[PDB]
């Protein structure tokens, strides 16, 4: 699209500048342009893609939750009728959020996943597919809600299967995948016991492998392990 | 308020 | 434009929702739509307009400063040549910022200022004109830099003249105007002594009028007086 | 880092 005339390397350079400037919409547009060049992404480039879209969708999710709460309060007993505006604006934000999720899922399907042969890249992209279906599931209410949930589940499960076969239990991608799949279980799938079991097992298997790691790898892994612990504390 | 990864500031 | 089919009251309602959701681009678009209905703005509505655009331009200014700093470092001795990308992206952000300033100045000229007869509204809009010319001056480098600076000065000065005649020294609009005009003097006009003199005189004349105020008005005025003090501490 | 009004968070 609009980035078709810009060099791949220039898009990557500008994505890093956009990150420093906290211009995440720009960062995401630059990374989309880089993906559309058709070459596979390096580890650093995959992280730029993830950071960009996580920040964009994060703003939308936070806004959606604010508006949904106001809407829900408006439909209580004794609440004064104030017209269609809250629903309309919630719908506007929701549609924009769904558009971002669809964009990410489109990049993954055309053609990031099919070209990803190394475990690290394949698991990364399948985790992303699970995440963006999960964000769609957060706002889904219609006929397709069950199918959206199953799409998230399926992507996470494929990623889990590869990660268990091909990666050590302390690998940060493996850890972040398991963390997010446990959140899926708790928040989306109405399966708090599965969420807790996964978080516990993941934490414990990582603990037992820390002894193999350098100081820097230890820091990376323990950061994500703390998030598992934080959830376990909240959930139990 | 569950924690996921990555996260924003 | 795009808001032409939405009721004025609905635009105002949605601006307040957008503020709660921290969706300031949306908030600004809703308020622009409300202005374009052609009716004068209430005090509350003027504040919504100001908040919306201040947040939008604030993000752009912060981004511009980050990129300008990187650019300036790139033009030092011993700095490695990394191509046109930093300049290009700084220019992109700059153009977007200039577009927002031009939009605000356009609303003021068509036709907020000419319809504003009460001191509170007229001073508010002339302060805004000064502010948005000031933001243009922050990024100006060409032939028109002197004219942009003079446009900011002229708007601030007209606002100051009205405010001194028609408003008490503790009026928050008067105080915020004087604060921002002092910042103009210090940061734009290379006149630190004028900046300090204005800040001092404004603070002192406000201090002497606090005794006339209710508890709530006292809180409003002293908040802005503290900003004058903060600048004086930084500047002396 | 001069202070102006209004300001953002
Ligand atoms: Ca090329
Ligand atoms: Ca919908
Ligand atoms: Ca391996
Ligand atoms: Ca149980
Ligand atoms: Ca969270
Ligand atoms: Ca009407
Ligand atoms: Ca320029
Ligand atoms: Ca008066
Ligand atoms: Ca002196
Ligand atoms: Ca400032
Ligand atoms: Cl809307
Ligand atoms: Cl650019």
Numbering used by the authors:
A (entry chain A), C (entry chain A): 1 to 236
B (entry chain B), D (entry chain B): 410 to 418
Tell me, in the authors' exact words, what the paper reports.
These ‘central hub’ proteins hold a key role in cellular signaling networks, as they are known to interact with over 1200 protein clients, and are involved in pathways related to metabolism, apoptosis, cell signaling and tumor development. Protein interaction with 14-3-3 can yield a multitude of effects,8e.g., the structural stabilization of the client protein, the masking of functional sequences, or bringing two proteins together. In this work, we developed and validated a deep learning approach for predicting putative protein–protein interaction sites between 14-3-3 proteins and phosphorylated client proteins.
Experimental validation confirmed the predictive power of our model, with three out of eight newly predicted phosphopeptides exhibiting low-micromolar binding affinities to 14-3-3, two weak binders and two binders with marginal affinity.
